[PDB]
Amino acid sequence: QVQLQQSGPRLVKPSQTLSLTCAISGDSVSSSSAVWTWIRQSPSRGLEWLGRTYYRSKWYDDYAVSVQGRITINPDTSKNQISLQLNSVTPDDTAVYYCARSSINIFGVFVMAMDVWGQGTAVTVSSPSTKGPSVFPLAPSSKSTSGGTAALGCLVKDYFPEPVTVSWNSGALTSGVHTFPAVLQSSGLYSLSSVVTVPSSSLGTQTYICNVNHKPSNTKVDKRVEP
Amino acid sequence: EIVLTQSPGTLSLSPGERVTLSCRASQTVYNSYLAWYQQKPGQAPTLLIYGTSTRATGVPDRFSGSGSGTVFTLTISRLEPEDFAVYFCQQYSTSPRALTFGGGTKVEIKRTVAAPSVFIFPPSDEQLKSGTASVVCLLNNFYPREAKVQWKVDNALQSGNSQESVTEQDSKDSTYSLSSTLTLSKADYEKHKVYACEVTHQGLSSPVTKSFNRGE
């Protein structure tokens, strides 16, 4: 089908340039039946349209008033992708950035309802350097597992910026997983926990590994958790 | 520039109930140009309705859109637990070329009270080698969200040295979980023996305490 694959998370220093890419599969970027758009989302301001590009015998760009003058959205037909360049960023540009397609045409007008979305790119505008996490096991006591249920986890500590991804057993274990929102420590570094409940009768026969990936620092850690 | 105002901001309703979400536009939005999206935690929004009233491909029949002019409505005929999400309206204007979203309505799922299961985790030996001790308390699968965590060290109530966070409502069982971290220096952690997390919640007949003894 149609999939939009975006850049991984980005850390950008204030006053510098954000550059993102959105690689398209299952459609042509130059399709006269498509419009390609960038939208961002922040907790403080919500969902905000940034601009669109589309090909109709020639390339067109339309940008939102809020960012006109520091935004470019360029297609690349050889890579079948669109980009986003946002200049002179400030902390107000910290957001999750989405690319999306709109193809719905009502009475000859592209009504700009977005039918396919990329996965989002978490962008942090801040001056500190990246730092990868330390990963520590959360091992349940012997007694706590005397019941039917064992709680296991990983503490993912002292990283910057967000986000981190945590999986269990390389994605094979999803039931009962809870990965919590990170908290910001007085050091300016984030700390997060991820836990899973499993049958105590498995603790001897089944291995449990938390897979931690902090893409901004290229840190990958696989921590076995043994009660 | 058309502003879309969504109401209410948050709703808490039982499965099986009818949900009515409102979107008010600061000026007329023509029918072709009003859309609705559903956004579940950690995911991009997905299109639910477009052209005011047309169900997007694959959308369950329980979702319907209506309205005109400046007042638009999204209805969920019978709420299901998986419908936990933020719902957004969106307008496109052709002249001037503009695209805006409402602020969202968060639909939370009302379920029966559920007591948390509680677990306490000592700091790992690995972390201690580094000079800091993190003690973690887990409150698993409870409802409603209100919960009290009290840390005690050698029976002294702790204050100012913990942080906590809470998951979003589970899409299946509609519960919350909460993680609290008590952070001590290694020196302080080694000065004391009994570490306890005491949990108060509507679903617990009396508070639950989980504890361990350092070194045991």
Author numbering:
A (entry chain H): 1 to 31, 31A, 31B, 32 to 52, 52A, 52B, 53 to 82, 82A, ...
B (entry chain L): 1 to 30, 30A, 31 to 95, 95A, 95B, 96 to 213
Give the published text.
We describe two genetically similar VH6-1 bnAb clonotypes from the same individual that exhibit different developmental paths toward broad neutralization activity. HA is a trimeric glycoprotein that is critical for viral entry and is composed of a globular head domain atop a more elongated stem domain.
We describe VH6-1 clonotype A, which started as a largely group 2-specific clonotype and then gained cross-reactivity to group 1 through somatic mutations. In agreement with the binding profiles of isolated clones from each clonotype, the early intermediate of clonotype A primarily recognized group 2 HA, whereas the early intermediate of clonotype B was specific to group 1 HA. Somatic mutations G100cT and S100fY on CDR H3 would stabilize the conformation of CDR H3. Specifically, mutation of Gly100c to Thr100c would help to rigidify CDR H3, whereas mutation of Ser100f to Tyr100f may acquire a π–π stacking interaction with Tyr49 of the light chain. Residues 100c and 100f are both too distant to interact directly with HA.
